[PDB]
């Protein structure tokens, strides 16, 4: 249970990214 | 006496001390099946 909440947290870190445009 | 056989059955095995160890290993299976579906979901993630 706590590998798979760690993968799932992970996966949200990764999704953010920084375009200015 | 007039019991069926298989009251007689659970008596004996009872009296072997057989019981907790039948509960607890029907009671995991249930688990580790779910723990198997968690590490699918966790194989799928891993791969994105």
């Given amino acids: ?21 | 006496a007039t019991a069926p056989d298989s009251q007689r059955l659970k008596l004996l095995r009872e009296v072997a001390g057989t019981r907790v160890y039948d509960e607890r290993k029907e009671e995991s299976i249930s688990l580790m099946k779910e723990t198997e579906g968690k590490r699918e979901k966790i194989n799928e993630l891993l791969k994105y």
């Fill in chain 1, 1 to 21: 249970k706590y590998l798979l909440a760690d993968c799932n947290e992970a996966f949200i870190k990764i999704k953010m990214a920084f375009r200015p445009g």
